[PDB]
């Protein structure tokens, strides 16, 4: 068998993109509840009805049926986030919200009842809007304390219910989305590289602190980082392009080097001097970062990029999707090998998928479904490359397909662009039945999981 | 300043490519005394007068004068190998040859007399002939034993005179050159890939063992691996070419990984299975490899290379890089490739790097200048070195840790490849020619004074 018998197959969501029930059971507002237009859109002073995340897909109530469908595909793993605000609504409460904790007790219980290991992202783009409003988010060192309090609460609570944790979904996404990712409510054109990198610093130190705390709580925990995998290729053999490509990749590598190796990499210094970035270390920081590093690295993969020294080219060898994104399956083998060569720790692919405009329609068997064979094709190809990476000896813990059940997108907060193996009937305008339907890819994915990948050949 | 105060500036040779005196003071035959056409050429049954290595440049005698020239340049480091056959003429002797030990004693003593730290390659393509014929070289596990005795003798004898050691010069070179590097007596069609890789395994084990020993003898020894640096670039952004390029680099990375990381790399399992290679481990091997890894990595750099998943589509190349200049001799020139490779190595390993072989081969014409001094005007070597060292400087600013730089063949020597003097690397011209004619007189090339200004400014004159 090519895939290891212990391989974790599954799907991944973030809480705010499915759950809904934004005001229920003590939940405080998150930054998402003010983001009707998504990561790329502006914010509203207060939540508004056009925001699809208030209802979501109603996973908060429907998780039992949805989870039954996961069990139907055979997921032995399911990734999601524990929403920070259902636990600490303002974020500064001395005491946790208990209804919030009980909901997740129930979720993890259903999961384990079906043979499904949860994988929990502690912070996936949903910061208490109170913390964001008051402190301007991760720009402020105080955030560490709050996050610590949050993490300690849940690690301690689920300590026997959840083995796999992730500290942050992409610490560096703070660069392109300060408010959505770091909860930084200050206008983007008023944020200097210094404030951004300082914020990410606070995130990384917190990641370490929480890793420590994690290990003290239970030693069987696995604490991974989560990072955006984007392999870069030189436009030409001209060594100036090859070096430009190298520098491009360091922007990303900078953060995983801290997560994994426990210190700012050698090139950082140069970059900082050139960018007017001087990090401010609290006395405890270096030892925290150094002594507590991730046990594994997880990542999202979608595409590669082609680079040039020339004063973001479109790669002539790559296919495109219906959405007009460039598809690169071999890029997944490449970045797997590159990360594994650099770090020598287990890898986890926690976000992958093909976004499409799927339409629900009656098949020849009269069943309402989606003929998503494009998504079957996409997943096939990517997983064949995963299998190549396994043969190269890369250590790969598992694969969670993104938006395994259709969810509200992060970028635009829309349901139109669907990644799911399970179609949810709700639309951008908010209308619909909320019924779930098997996509054609549901069955196929089922077969890949039950054969532990053998069906791929 | 940009270069660190303790940076090591110097030049490098191999003992057999310079020393001469092939038979003197008890010295046994190496594999090289029977290689008159070099490593690409074929062996004879006995040494022959047309072998340029027999007399070399006679560094054995004139070493004091040449070292005077070095010190004139301001070398604080000089790299060479201890010729194995001068210590153990056969290699199986119970006691070492005192004449050889005393010879290198005086060598290191002159070097230190001028403030030049020796950098010693323990094995540089010098394997004693007795061992190469009798055991067929590294194909036989016993070589470890013979290497260890030898190594232990010198580490012990030089423990106060020598800080920096290299175990081997390119273990993987055994792949192309079984006899020259590996001392492997068996012909080419008779060697499988299993055999060559097994030999390499013996080399790596030996390297570890010798690191253990060295650490026991002197805790201040810096011990390092020597490797060929060849950065590869894809011909196009096609991810197939990018994967091909990756695969190619793994061929070189395999060995650096065993040396530095201490075990065969994850991609090796697939490569060996696909190539019918199965490494026989002695019970203690893995823990030796794992527990004793190098303190630093040194490499030689000359050129980059270009790869494609479908090379026959280019109808030439292999793979010529459309963007690089070529040397008169016909090698492509890629100074930025030095920065690229320094960075790739440091990104992977995170240990100090040492550039121990770099230079420009050319056919140098000795002529009288306007001042009536006989020189070589090599502005091309000055430009090659300037560009390469500026890139070294960029890598230094990238935060790469680099111990030093030693210009290859800093005084013209006998090429390893063809065993010839016409292709000259040196800052110091030696008058001897492919035939064996000439004074064997030495002359400062124009590049001599330049490299002097560089070394004495600690790189600041590069800018």
PDB file of N, CA and C in Angstrom, chain A residues 233-240 242-243 246-247 250 261 263 266-267 270 306 315-318 328 330-331 333-334 337-338 340-344 388 391-394, chain B residues 233-240 242-243 246-247 250 261 263 266-267 270 306 321-324 334 336-337 339-340 343-344 346-348 350 394-395 397-400:
ATOM      1  N   UNK A 233       8.703  29.208  -9.223  1.00  0.00           N
ATOM      2  CA  UNK A 233       9.529  28.728 -10.333  1.00  0.00           C
ATOM      3  C   UNK A 233      10.110  29.942 -11.065  1.00  0.00           C
ATOM      4  N   UNK A 234      11.381  29.872 -11.504  1.00  0.00           N
ATOM      5  CA  UNK A 234      12.004  30.974 -12.251  1.00  0.00           C
ATOM      6  C   UNK A 234      11.522  31.039 -13.699  1.00  0.00           C
ATOM      7  N   UNK A 235      11.271  32.234 -14.212  1.00  0.00           N
ATOM      8  CA  UNK A 235      10.737  32.348 -15.557  1.00  0.00           C
ATOM      9  C   UNK A 235      11.766  31.832 -16.571  1.00  0.00           C
ATOM     10  N   UNK A 236      13.048  32.046 -16.278  1.00  0.00           N
ATOM     11  CA  UNK A 236      14.145  31.598 -17.136  1.00  0.00           C
ATOM     12  C   UNK A 236      15.353  31.187 -16.294  1.00  0.00           C
ATOM     13  N   UNK A 237      16.231  30.336 -16.856  1.00  0.00           N
ATOM     14  CA  UNK A 237      17.515  29.897 -16.283  1.00  0.00           C
ATOM     15  C   UNK A 237      18.488  31.053 -15.999  1.00  0.00           C
ATOM     16  N   UNK A 238      18.176  32.248 -16.478  1.00  0.00           N
ATOM     17  CA  UNK A 238      18.990  33.406 -16.139  1.00  0.00           C
ATOM     18  C   UNK A 238      19.152  33.435 -14.631  1.00  0.00           C
ATOM     19  N   UNK A 239      20.399  33.404 -14.137  1.00  0.00           N
ATOM     20  CA  UNK A 239      20.588  33.296 -12.679  1.00  0.00           C
ATOM     21  C   UNK A 239      19.983  34.458 -11.881  1.00  0.00           C
ATOM     22  N   UNK A 240      19.753  35.596 -12.526  1.00  0.00           N
ATOM     23  CA  UNK A 240      19.079  36.715 -11.863  1.00  0.00           C
ATOM     24  C   UNK A 240      17.616  36.389 -11.508  1.00  0.00           C
ATOM     25  N   UNK A 242      16.590  33.206 -11.130  1.00  0.00           N
ATOM     26  CA  UNK A 242      16.619  32.135 -10.153  1.00  0.00           C
ATOM     27  C   UNK A 242      16.822  32.719  -8.748  1.00  0.00           C
ATOM     28  N   UNK A 243      17.673  33.734  -8.651  1.00  0.00           N
ATOM     29  CA  UNK A 243      17.861  34.403  -7.379  1.00  0.00           C
ATOM     30  C   UNK A 243      16.619  35.219  -6.954  1.00  0.00           C
ATOM     31  N   UNK A 246      14.304  32.817  -5.473  1.00  0.00           N
ATOM     32  CA  UNK A 246      14.758  32.479  -4.125  1.00  0.00           C
ATOM     33  C   UNK A 246      14.300  33.528  -3.114  1.00  0.00           C
ATOM     34  N   UNK A 247      14.591  34.792  -3.405  1.00  0.00           N
ATOM     35  CA  UNK A 247      14.184  35.861  -2.495  1.00  0.00           C
ATOM     36  C   UNK A 247      12.672  35.882  -2.297  1.00  0.00           C
ATOM     37  N   UNK A 250      11.745  33.318   0.230  1.00  0.00           N
ATOM     38  CA  UNK A 250      12.099  33.626   1.616  1.00  0.00           C
ATOM     39  C   UNK A 250      11.021  34.423   2.385  1.00  0.00           C
ATOM     40  N   UNK A 261      12.110  26.021  13.397  1.00  0.00           N
ATOM     41  CA  UNK A 261      13.489  26.111  13.879  1.00  0.00           C
ATOM     42  C   UNK A 261      13.665  26.971  15.125  1.00  0.00           C
ATOM     43  N   UNK A 263      13.832  30.326  15.658  1.00  0.00           N
ATOM     44  CA  UNK A 263      14.495  31.629  15.669  1.00  0.00           C
ATOM     45  C   UNK A 263      14.377  32.304  14.314  1.00  0.00           C
ATOM     46  N   UNK A 266      18.655  33.437   9.238  1.00  0.00           N
ATOM     47  CA  UNK A 266      19.798  34.296   8.947  1.00  0.00           C
ATOM     48  C   UNK A 266      19.513  35.447   7.975  1.00  0.00           C
ATOM     49  N   UNK A 267      18.654  35.216   6.984  1.00  0.00           N
ATOM     50  CA  UNK A 267      18.360  36.239   5.974  1.00  0.00           C
ATOM     51  C   UNK A 267      17.428  37.343   6.477  1.00  0.00           C
ATOM     52  N   UNK A 270      18.892  40.861   7.077  1.00  0.00           N
ATOM     53  CA  UNK A 270      19.015  41.698   5.889  1.00  0.00           C
ATOM     54  C   UNK A 270      17.653  42.287   5.493  1.00  0.00           C
ATOM     55  N   UNK A 306       5.204  31.962 -10.756  1.00  0.00           N
ATOM     56  CA  UNK A 306       6.379  32.058 -11.592  1.00  0.00           C
ATOM     57  C   UNK A 306       6.959  33.461 -11.448  1.00  0.00           C
ATOM     58  N   UNK A 315       2.429  31.495 -16.156  1.00  0.00           N
ATOM     59  CA  UNK A 315       3.120  30.302 -16.596  1.00  0.00           C
ATOM     60  C   UNK A 315       2.423  29.675 -17.795  1.00  0.00           C
ATOM     61  N   UNK A 316       3.129  29.596 -18.934  1.00  0.00           N
ATOM     62  CA  UNK A 316       2.613  29.082 -20.207  1.00  0.00           C
ATOM     63  C   UNK A 316       2.360  27.588 -20.182  1.00  0.00           C
ATOM     64  N   UNK A 317       2.869  26.869 -19.185  1.00  0.00           N
ATOM     65  CA  UNK A 317       2.717  25.411 -19.196  1.00  0.00           C
ATOM     66  C   UNK A 317       1.531  24.910 -18.358  1.00  0.00           C
ATOM     67  N   UNK A 318       0.839  25.826 -17.689  1.00  0.00           N
ATOM     68  CA  UNK A 318      -0.197  25.419 -16.747  1.00  0.00           C
ATOM     69  C   UNK A 318      -1.614  25.568 -17.304  1.00  0.00           C
ATOM     70  N   UNK A 328      -1.873  23.552 -10.830  1.00  0.00           N
ATOM     71  CA  UNK A 328      -0.525  22.977 -10.802  1.00  0.00           C
ATOM     72  C   UNK A 328      -0.370  21.824  -9.818  1.00  0.00           C
ATOM     73  N   UNK A 330       1.710  19.176  -9.962  1.00  0.00           N
ATOM     74  CA  UNK A 330       3.104  18.784  -9.728  1.00  0.00           C
ATOM     75  C   UNK A 330       3.723  19.730  -8.706  1.00  0.00           C
ATOM     76  N   UNK A 331       3.259  20.979  -8.705  1.00  0.00           N
ATOM     77  CA  UNK A 331       3.610  21.917  -7.654  1.00  0.00           C
ATOM     78  C   UNK A 331       3.414  21.380  -6.232  1.00  0.00           C
ATOM     79  N   UNK A 333       3.675  18.032  -5.224  1.00  0.00           N
ATOM     80  CA  UNK A 333       4.881  17.214  -5.030  1.00  0.00           C
ATOM     81  C   UNK A 333       6.114  18.060  -4.743  1.00  0.00           C
ATOM     82  N   UNK A 334       6.246  19.136  -5.495  1.00  0.00           N
ATOM     83  CA  UNK A 334       7.419  19.979  -5.343  1.00  0.00           C
ATOM     84  C   UNK A 334       7.469  20.632  -3.978  1.00  0.00           C
ATOM     85  N   UNK A 337       8.131  18.127  -1.165  1.00  0.00           N
ATOM     86  CA  UNK A 337       9.547  17.795  -1.053  1.00  0.00           C
ATOM     87  C   UNK A 337      10.396  18.942  -0.527  1.00  0.00           C
ATOM     88  N   UNK A 338      10.109  20.163  -0.954  1.00  0.00           N
ATOM     89  CA  UNK A 338      10.870  21.312  -0.480  1.00  0.00           C
ATOM     90  C   UNK A 338      10.739  21.530   1.030  1.00  0.00           C
ATOM     91  N   UNK A 340       9.793  19.247   3.216  1.00  0.00           N
ATOM     92  CA  UNK A 340      10.360  18.110   3.930  1.00  0.00           C
ATOM     93  C   UNK A 340      11.909  18.129   3.928  1.00  0.00           C
ATOM     94  N   UNK A 341      12.509  18.524   2.805  1.00  0.00           N
ATOM     95  CA  UNK A 341      13.958  18.685   2.709  1.00  0.00           C
ATOM     96  C   UNK A 341      14.417  19.731   3.705  1.00  0.00           C
ATOM     97  N   UNK A 342      13.689  20.831   3.793  1.00  0.00           N
ATOM     98  CA  UNK A 342      14.141  21.892   4.679  1.00  0.00           C
ATOM     99  C   UNK A 342      14.004  21.531   6.167  1.00  0.00           C
ATOM    100  N   UNK A 343      12.830  21.006   6.547  1.00  0.00           N
ATOM    101  CA  UNK A 343      12.476  20.802   7.950  1.00  0.00           C
ATOM    102  C   UNK A 343      12.530  19.386   8.546  1.00  0.00           C
ATOM    103  N   UNK A 344      12.452  18.370   7.701  1.00  0.00           N
ATOM    104  CA  UNK A 344      12.442  16.993   8.191  1.00  0.00           C
ATOM    105  C   UNK A 344      11.382  16.669   9.258  1.00  0.00           C
ATOM    106  N   UNK A 388       3.149  10.382  -4.930  1.00  0.00           N
ATOM    107  CA  UNK A 388       4.537  10.499  -5.373  1.00  0.00           C
ATOM    108  C   UNK A 388       5.390  11.034  -4.233  1.00  0.00           C
ATOM    109  N   UNK A 391       6.124   8.351  -1.743  1.00  0.00           N
ATOM    110  CA  UNK A 391       7.175   7.467  -2.200  1.00  0.00           C
ATOM    111  C   UNK A 391       8.558   8.131  -2.073  1.00  0.00           C
ATOM    112  N   UNK A 392       8.655   9.448  -2.291  1.00  0.00           N
ATOM    113  CA  UNK A 392       9.935  10.160  -2.113  1.00  0.00           C
ATOM    114  C   UNK A 392      10.338  10.123  -0.630  1.00  0.00           C
ATOM    115  N   UNK A 393       9.475   9.546   0.204  1.00  0.00           N
ATOM    116  CA  UNK A 393       9.790   9.377   1.614  1.00  0.00           C
ATOM    117  C   UNK A 393       9.371  10.544   2.491  1.00  0.00           C
ATOM    118  N   UNK A 394       8.665  11.508   1.906  1.00  0.00           N
ATOM    119  CA  UNK A 394       8.143  12.608   2.695  1.00  0.00           C
ATOM    120  C   UNK A 394       7.157  12.028   3.712  1.00  0.00           C
TER     121      UNK A 394
ATOM    122  N   UNK B 233      19.438  24.830 -12.515  1.00  0.00           N
ATOM    123  CA  UNK B 233      18.307  25.690 -12.848  1.00  0.00           C
ATOM    124  C   UNK B 233      17.462  25.025 -13.915  1.00  0.00           C
ATOM    125  N   UNK B 234      16.128  25.154 -13.822  1.00  0.00           N
ATOM    126  CA  UNK B 234      15.274  24.634 -14.896  1.00  0.00           C
ATOM    127  C   UNK B 234      15.298  25.536 -16.131  1.00  0.00           C
ATOM    128  N   UNK B 235      15.327  24.915 -17.303  1.00  0.00           N
ATOM    129  CA  UNK B 235      15.315  25.621 -18.583  1.00  0.00           C
ATOM    130  C   UNK B 235      14.064  26.487 -18.736  1.00  0.00           C
ATOM    131  N   UNK B 236      12.931  26.004 -18.192  1.00  0.00           N
ATOM    132  CA  UNK B 236      11.638  26.708 -18.216  1.00  0.00           C
ATOM    133  C   UNK B 236      10.803  26.491 -16.933  1.00  0.00           C
ATOM    134  N   UNK B 237       9.848  27.399 -16.670  1.00  0.00           N
ATOM    135  CA  UNK B 237       8.865  27.362 -15.571  1.00  0.00           C
ATOM    136  C   UNK B 237       7.945  26.134 -15.584  1.00  0.00           C
ATOM    137  N   UNK B 238       7.976  25.340 -16.643  1.00  0.00           N
ATOM    138  CA  UNK B 238       7.253  24.085 -16.637  1.00  0.00           C
ATOM    139  C   UNK B 238       7.612  23.300 -15.386  1.00  0.00           C
ATOM    140  N   UNK B 239       6.595  22.936 -14.580  1.00  0.00           N
ATOM    141  CA  UNK B 239       6.833  22.240 -13.306  1.00  0.00           C
ATOM    142  C   UNK B 239       7.488  20.880 -13.518  1.00  0.00           C
ATOM    143  N   UNK B 240       7.391  20.355 -14.728  1.00  0.00           N
ATOM    144  CA  UNK B 240       8.092  19.120 -15.035  1.00  0.00           C
ATOM    145  C   UNK B 240       9.616  19.357 -15.038  1.00  0.00           C
ATOM    146  N   UNK B 242      11.074  21.727 -13.428  1.00  0.00           N
ATOM    147  CA  UNK B 242      11.399  22.092 -12.054  1.00  0.00           C
ATOM    148  C   UNK B 242      11.569  20.832 -11.202  1.00  0.00           C
ATOM    149  N   UNK B 243      10.737  19.834 -11.472  1.00  0.00           N
ATOM    150  CA  UNK B 243      10.884  18.578 -10.760  1.00  0.00           C
ATOM    151  C   UNK B 243      12.170  17.873 -11.208  1.00  0.00           C
ATOM    152  N   UNK B 246      15.043  19.299  -9.544  1.00  0.00           N
ATOM    153  CA  UNK B 246      15.083  18.842  -8.152  1.00  0.00           C
ATOM    154  C   UNK B 246      15.727  17.454  -8.023  1.00  0.00           C
ATOM    155  N   UNK B 247      15.287  16.556  -8.894  1.00  0.00           N
ATOM    156  CA  UNK B 247      15.749  15.180  -8.896  1.00  0.00           C
ATOM    157  C   UNK B 247      17.265  15.179  -9.105  1.00  0.00           C
ATOM    158  N   UNK B 250      19.235  16.106  -6.127  1.00  0.00           N
ATOM    159  CA  UNK B 250      19.266  15.054  -5.104  1.00  0.00           C
ATOM    160  C   UNK B 250      20.509  14.129  -5.246  1.00  0.00           C
ATOM    161  N   UNK B 261      23.745  15.540   8.209  1.00  0.00           N
ATOM    162  CA  UNK B 261      22.553  15.109   8.952  1.00  0.00           C
ATOM    163  C   UNK B 261      22.725  13.774   9.687  1.00  0.00           C
ATOM    164  N   UNK B 263      22.480  10.396   8.364  1.00  0.00           N
ATOM    165  CA  UNK B 263      21.753   9.198   7.943  1.00  0.00           C
ATOM    166  C   UNK B 263      21.311   9.387   6.505  1.00  0.00           C
ATOM    167  N   UNK B 266      15.599  10.652   3.048  1.00  0.00           N
ATOM    168  CA  UNK B 266      14.339   9.989   2.723  1.00  0.00           C
ATOM    169  C   UNK B 266      14.151   9.574   1.252  1.00  0.00           C
ATOM    170  N   UNK B 267      14.629  10.394   0.316  1.00  0.00           N
ATOM    171  CA  UNK B 267      14.532  10.096  -1.120  1.00  0.00           C
ATOM    172  C   UNK B 267      15.494   8.976  -1.577  1.00  0.00           C
ATOM    173  N   UNK B 270      13.742   5.345  -2.249  1.00  0.00           N
ATOM    174  CA  UNK B 270      13.211   5.222  -3.600  1.00  0.00           C
ATOM    175  C   UNK B 270      14.328   5.103  -4.627  1.00  0.00           C
ATOM    176  N   UNK B 306      22.035  23.519 -16.200  1.00  0.00           N
ATOM    177  CA  UNK B 306      20.651  23.702 -16.573  1.00  0.00           C
ATOM    178  C   UNK B 306      20.013  22.364 -16.887  1.00  0.00           C
ATOM    179  N   UNK B 321      23.266  27.256 -20.862  1.00  0.00           N
ATOM    180  CA  UNK B 321      22.464  28.355 -20.353  1.00  0.00           C
ATOM    181  C   UNK B 321      22.546  29.570 -21.283  1.00  0.00           C
ATOM    182  N   UNK B 322      21.431  29.930 -21.925  1.00  0.00           N
ATOM    183  CA  UNK B 322      21.491  31.023 -22.896  1.00  0.00           C
ATOM    184  C   UNK B 322      22.085  32.293 -22.301  1.00  0.00           C
ATOM    185  N   UNK B 323      22.068  32.452 -20.980  1.00  0.00           N
ATOM    186  CA  UNK B 323      22.411  33.751 -20.400  1.00  0.00           C
ATOM    187  C   UNK B 323      23.839  33.942 -19.874  1.00  0.00           C
ATOM    188  N   UNK B 324      24.667  32.899 -19.913  1.00  0.00           N
ATOM    189  CA  UNK B 324      25.996  32.975 -19.289  1.00  0.00           C
ATOM    190  C   UNK B 324      27.137  33.116 -20.306  1.00  0.00           C
ATOM    191  N   UNK B 334      29.359  31.607 -14.058  1.00  0.00           N
ATOM    192  CA  UNK B 334      28.138  31.938 -13.319  1.00  0.00           C
ATOM    193  C   UNK B 334      28.431  32.372 -11.891  1.00  0.00           C
ATOM    194  N   UNK B 336      26.800  34.470  -9.915  1.00  0.00           N
ATOM    195  CA  UNK B 336      25.621  34.536  -9.042  1.00  0.00           C
ATOM    196  C   UNK B 336      25.282  33.147  -8.538  1.00  0.00           C
ATOM    197  N   UNK B 337      25.569  32.138  -9.356  1.00  0.00           N
ATOM    198  CA  UNK B 337      25.383  30.751  -8.964  1.00  0.00           C
ATOM    199  C   UNK B 337      26.113  30.395  -7.672  1.00  0.00           C
ATOM    200  N   UNK B 339      26.460  32.531  -5.084  1.00  0.00           N
ATOM    201  CA  UNK B 339      25.530  33.045  -4.069  1.00  0.00           C
ATOM    202  C   UNK B 339      24.343  32.109  -3.887  1.00  0.00           C
ATOM    203  N   UNK B 340      23.801  31.662  -5.010  1.00  0.00           N
ATOM    204  CA  UNK B 340      22.664  30.754  -4.977  1.00  0.00           C
ATOM    205  C   UNK B 340      23.002  29.473  -4.228  1.00  0.00           C
ATOM    206  N   UNK B 343      23.667  29.881  -0.457  1.00  0.00           N
ATOM    207  CA  UNK B 343      22.362  29.961   0.200  1.00  0.00           C
ATOM    208  C   UNK B 343      21.597  28.658   0.262  1.00  0.00           C
ATOM    209  N   UNK B 344      21.615  27.872  -0.801  1.00  0.00           N
ATOM    210  CA  UNK B 344      20.883  26.609  -0.748  1.00  0.00           C
ATOM    211  C   UNK B 344      21.477  25.704   0.328  1.00  0.00           C
ATOM    212  N   UNK B 346      23.257  26.591   2.994  1.00  0.00           N
ATOM    213  CA  UNK B 346      23.047  27.096   4.346  1.00  0.00           C
ATOM    214  C   UNK B 346      21.595  26.953   4.793  1.00  0.00           C
ATOM    215  N   UNK B 347      20.663  27.168   3.867  1.00  0.00           N
ATOM    216  CA  UNK B 347      19.239  26.994   4.141  1.00  0.00           C
ATOM    217  C   UNK B 347      18.966  25.567   4.582  1.00  0.00           C
ATOM    218  N   UNK B 348      19.563  24.612   3.878  1.00  0.00           N
ATOM    219  CA  UNK B 348      19.366  23.207   4.222  1.00  0.00           C
ATOM    220  C   UNK B 348      20.039  22.789   5.546  1.00  0.00           C
ATOM    221  N   UNK B 350      22.406  24.767   7.845  1.00  0.00           N
ATOM    222  CA  UNK B 350      22.616  25.665   8.978  1.00  0.00           C
ATOM    223  C   UNK B 350      23.938  25.402   9.718  1.00  0.00           C
ATOM    224  N   UNK B 394      27.754  39.099  -0.998  1.00  0.00           N
ATOM    225  CA  UNK B 394      26.290  39.109  -0.928  1.00  0.00           C
ATOM    226  C   UNK B 394      25.789  38.000  -0.004  1.00  0.00           C
ATOM    227  N   UNK B 395      26.264  36.774  -0.222  1.00  0.00           N
ATOM    228  CA  UNK B 395      25.905  35.653   0.652  1.00  0.00           C
ATOM    229  C   UNK B 395      26.226  35.941   2.119  1.00  0.00           C
ATOM    230  N   UNK B 397      26.210  38.855   3.515  1.00  0.00           N
ATOM    231  CA  UNK B 397      25.190  39.783   3.959  1.00  0.00           C
ATOM    232  C   UNK B 397      23.825  39.086   4.100  1.00  0.00           C
ATOM    233  N   UNK B 398      23.607  38.039   3.310  1.00  0.00           N
ATOM    234  CA  UNK B 398      22.430  37.178   3.457  1.00  0.00           C
ATOM    235  C   UNK B 398      22.450  36.448   4.807  1.00  0.00           C
ATOM    236  N   UNK B 399      23.532  36.611   5.549  1.00  0.00           N
ATOM    237  CA  UNK B 399      23.639  35.947   6.832  1.00  0.00           C
ATOM    238  C   UNK B 399      24.213  34.542   6.760  1.00  0.00           C
ATOM    239  N   UNK B 400      24.657  34.120   5.577  1.00  0.00           N
ATOM    240  CA  UNK B 400      25.347  32.840   5.471  1.00  0.00           C
ATOM    241  C   UNK B 400      26.659  32.907   6.246  1.00  0.00           C
TER     242      UNK B 400
END
